[PDB]
Design an enzyme around this catalytic site. Structure first.
Site, PDB file in Angstrom:
ATOM      1  N   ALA A  20       0.864  -1.151   0.000  1.00 22.12           N
ATOM      2  CA  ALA A  20       0.000   0.000   0.000  1.00 22.12           C
ATOM      3  C   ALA A  20       0.914   1.218   0.000  1.00 22.12           C
ATOM      4  O   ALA A  20       1.425   1.625   1.030  1.00 22.12           O
ATOM      5  CB  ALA A  20      -0.958  -0.032   1.210  1.00 22.12           C
ATOM      6  N   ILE A  21       1.141   1.782  -1.183  1.00 19.22           N
ATOM      7  CA  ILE A  21       2.095   2.873  -1.348  1.00 19.22           C
ATOM      8  C   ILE A  21       1.385   4.151  -1.862  1.00 19.22           C
ATOM      9  O   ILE A  21       0.338   4.083  -2.513  1.00 19.22           O
ATOM     10  CB  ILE A  21       3.319   2.373  -2.174  1.00 19.22           C
ATOM     11  CG1 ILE A  21       4.209   1.452  -1.297  1.00 19.22           C
ATOM     12  CG2 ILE A  21       4.196   3.522  -2.737  1.00 19.22           C
ATOM     13  CD1 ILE A  21       4.888   0.398  -2.092  1.00 19.22           C
TER      14      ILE A  21
ATOM     15  N   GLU B 187       2.848  -9.692 -14.024  1.00 14.43           N
ATOM     16  CA  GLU B 187       1.798 -10.621 -14.454  1.00 14.43           C
ATOM     17  C   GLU B 187       2.240 -11.488 -15.629  1.00 14.43           C
ATOM     18  O   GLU B 187       1.843 -12.656 -15.719  1.00 14.43           O
ATOM     19  CB  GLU B 187       0.546  -9.854 -14.807  1.00 14.43           C
ATOM     20  CG  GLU B 187      -0.709 -10.702 -15.234  1.00 14.43           C
ATOM     21  CD  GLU B 187      -1.951  -9.874 -15.357  1.00 14.43           C
ATOM     22  OE1 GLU B 187      -2.582  -9.650 -14.293  1.00 14.43           O
ATOM     23  OE2 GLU B 187      -2.310  -9.425 -16.500  1.00 14.43           O
TER      24      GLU B 187
ATOM     25  N   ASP C 180     -14.542  -7.911 -10.797  1.00 16.86           N
ATOM     26  CA  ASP C 180     -14.800  -6.468 -10.921  1.00 16.86           C
ATOM     27  C   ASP C 180     -16.234  -6.365 -11.433  1.00 16.86           C
ATOM     28  O   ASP C 180     -16.482  -6.536 -12.625  1.00 16.86           O
ATOM     29  CB  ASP C 180     -13.767  -5.834 -11.874  1.00 16.86           C
ATOM     30  CG  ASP C 180     -13.891  -4.309 -11.956  1.00 16.86           C
ATOM     31  OD1 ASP C 180     -14.926  -3.754 -11.571  1.00 16.86           O
ATOM     32  OD2 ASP C 180     -12.915  -3.682 -12.358  1.00 16.86           O
TER      33      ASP C 180
END
Ligand SMILES: [Hg+2]
Ligand SMILES: [Hg+2]
Ligand SMILES: [Hg+2]
Ligand SMILES: [Hg+2]
Length: 262
Positions: free
Chosen positions: A59-60, A220, A243
């Site tokens: 988490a940046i 990925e 999603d």
């Protein structure tokens, strides 16, 4: 250890578990859809081994804003009843929200495959912070090595997969190769297998750097190459990575368990 006496419906040898989806890979690894598993059986097996699951998230910058909902929903849905260690990797340790955890659940903030993971957890699960849990994600996923089917590609033929196609890349996969298109997030397994994977990808990516090439979908693309050559012991259906704004809610998904945040 033995399981206790338990009461549950008898498995039906002559009834397919699902008529709409593939529930086992050709290397005999389960593909995890709702209906495939009895969760009470699996919880007993894993509780009896006193299983600890680590959950890692990066988490940046702006992404720290997503931690509150991420942790709060993991508290409702992720491995409930089992020991859980969250590892938050962040550039902003002080901006990590104070989230109340259930018993047997702990959080470490690490400021941005350490050996610390070996002594601490049995399994590692590696996800992104800009998501929320909406339904059960539990021990049914746990196995030496797993990846999740990308929600945009589960019905695609391999020719349409967005694998890296240039032979000069370590992530190269040609048109006549490929099982599935795995999303470069939500993978995991035993600490050993996860460290082997991240080590292989990190070495392949450095080779690409030295050769002046960067794979089409980065991390990925390399994950896809790794899982082609080292078959995962389970594959998760897109129930585990959805999603709904982009993709709706098709009939083939009986649950939407872990989803993108608006
Ligand atoms: Hg079934
Ligand atoms: Hg990880
Ligand atoms: Hg990498
Ligand atoms: Hg990777």
């Amino acid at each position: 250890v033995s399981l206790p006496r338990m009461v549950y419906p008898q498995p039906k040898v002559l009834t397919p578990c699902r008529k709409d989806v593939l529930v086992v890979t050709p290397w005999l690894a389960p593909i995890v859809w709702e209906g495939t598993f009895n969760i009470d059986i699996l919880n007993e097996q894993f509780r009896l081994q006193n299983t600890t699951i680590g959950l890692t998230v990066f988490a940046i910058k702006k992404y720290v804003a997503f931690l509150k909902l991420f942790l709060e929903t993991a508290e409702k849905h992720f491995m409930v009843g089992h020991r859980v260690h969250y590892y938050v990797f962040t550039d902003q340790p002080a901006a990590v929200p104070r989230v109340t955890l259930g018993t047997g659940r702990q959080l470490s903030v690490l400021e941005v495959c350490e050996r610390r993971f070996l002594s601490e957890v049995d399994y590692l699960v590696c996800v992104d912070v800009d998501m929320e849990f909406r339904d059960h994600v539990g021990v049914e996923i746990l196995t030496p090595l797993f990846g999740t089917l990308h929600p945009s590609f589960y019905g695609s033929s391999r020719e349409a997969f967005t694998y890296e196609r240039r032979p000069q890349s370590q992530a190269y996969i040609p048109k006549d190769e490929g099982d599935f298109y795995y999303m470069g997030t939500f993978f995991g397994g035993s600490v050993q297998e996860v460290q082997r994977l991240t080590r292989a990808c990190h070495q392949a990516m450095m080779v690409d750097q030295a050769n002046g090439i960067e794979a089409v979908w980065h991390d990925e693309s390399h994950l896809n190459k790794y899982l082609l050559r080292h078959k995962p012991t389970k594959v998760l259906s897109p129930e585990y990575l959805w999603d709904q704004q982009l993709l709706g809610w098709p009939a083939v998904l009986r649950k939407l368990r872990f989803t993108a945040v608006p």
